[PDB]
Amino acid sequence: KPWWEDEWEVPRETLKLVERLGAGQFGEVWMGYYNGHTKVAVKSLKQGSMSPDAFLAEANLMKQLQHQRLVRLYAVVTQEPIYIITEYMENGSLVDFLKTPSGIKLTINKLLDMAAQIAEGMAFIEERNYIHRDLRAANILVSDTLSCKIADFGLARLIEDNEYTAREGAKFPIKWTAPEAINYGTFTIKSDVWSFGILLTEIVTHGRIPYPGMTNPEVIQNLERGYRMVRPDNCPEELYQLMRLCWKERPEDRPTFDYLRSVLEDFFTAT
Numbered sequence: 001k002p003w004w005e006d007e008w009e010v011p012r013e014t015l016k017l018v019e020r021l022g023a024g025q026f027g028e029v030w031m032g033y034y035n036g037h038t039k040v041a042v043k044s045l046k047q048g049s050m051s052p053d054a055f056l057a058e059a060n061l062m063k064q065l066q067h068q069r070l071v072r073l074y075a076v077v078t079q080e081p082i083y084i085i086t087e088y089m090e091n092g093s094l095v096d097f098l099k100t101p102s103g104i105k106l107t108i109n110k111l112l113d114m115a116a117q118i119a120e121g122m123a124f125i126e127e128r129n130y131i132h133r134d135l136r137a138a139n140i141l142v143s144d145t146l147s148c149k150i151a152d153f154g155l156a157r158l159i160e161d162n163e164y165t166a167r168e169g170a171k172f173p174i175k176w177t178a179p180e181a182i183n184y185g186t187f188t189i190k191s192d193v194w195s196f197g198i199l200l201t202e203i204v205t206h207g208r209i210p211y212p213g214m215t216n217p218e219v220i221q222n223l224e225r226g227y228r229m230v231r232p233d234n235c236p237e238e239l240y241q242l243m244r245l246c247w248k249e250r251p252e253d254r255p256t257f258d259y260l261r262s263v264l265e266d267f268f269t270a271t
């Protein structure tokens with residue numbers, strides 16, 4: 001739909017950018033207000049940094065993926081500089097929040113709760129035939145009520161034939177990415193399941209880097225021998241075995257996200 005008919009388009013004047021939360025190669029993210037009263041996050045495109053078409057494809061995906069557990073598209077401004085305006089998440093990134101005084105005090109019970117909210121969001125994505133491909137604690141946001149949502153849909157893709165195949169050159173973070181995706185560029189929902197397992201280690205260690213003390217080649221080398229990440233300090237064995245299920249050699253032997261949700265809810269109500 002053209003901008004003059006798109007329900008998501010808003011006049012730039014409705015927005016007041018108050019506090020810059022981040023700045024990078026491709027633009028800025030601000031906390032702001034829509035029509036004076038409603039707090040929003042606003043991502044801006046640095047003109048010439050990258051294609052505006054590529055920038056806006058993120059918002060177009062979000063139009064197709066609406067759910068309580070996913071950060072919600074709020075609006076777009078499709079004239080330069082381009083803004084993607086989204087649901088504001090007051091406690092920021094999960095990776096950051098887990099290190100603050102509040103996040104530090106969380107019981108294993110609340111951690112397992114949050115793990116299950118994240119799985120619930122991914123179960124939606126799974127049911128809708130999408131994949132995320134960038135699933136990790138940096139890409140989970142936390143509300144003021146300590147609930148969690150999936151964010152950053154820039155790499156997310158609709159899958160018709162089960163499989164998305166990236167290009168020869170394309171690079172992905174080694175620690176978080178399923179072997180098949182790193183080796184062949186092939187992604188499925190099961191590649192997200194493997195990433196969820198890594199994300200679980202981030203939850204339980206309060207945002208520490210996976211594979212403590214290992215370089216990328218050491219990780220690759222270890223996985224090929226059949227080793228998986230060493231038991232994080234203070235990880236319940238139950239959760240550790242659930243991470244192992246996510247790290248199964250064959251994609252198709254990895255559990256579904258609805259299963260993960262289910263199990264984690266059981267882990268939560270039992271604690």
Ligand SMILES: CCSc1nc(-c2ccc(OC)c(OC)c2)cc2nccn12
Pocket residue numbers: 021022029041086087088089090091092093141
């Ligand atoms: C900047 C990454 S995107 C992003 N960050 C925060 C956020 C909230 C509180 C913070 O407190 C430190 C923070 O860190 C800069 C980020 C909130 C938020 N809502 C939607 C996207 N958001």
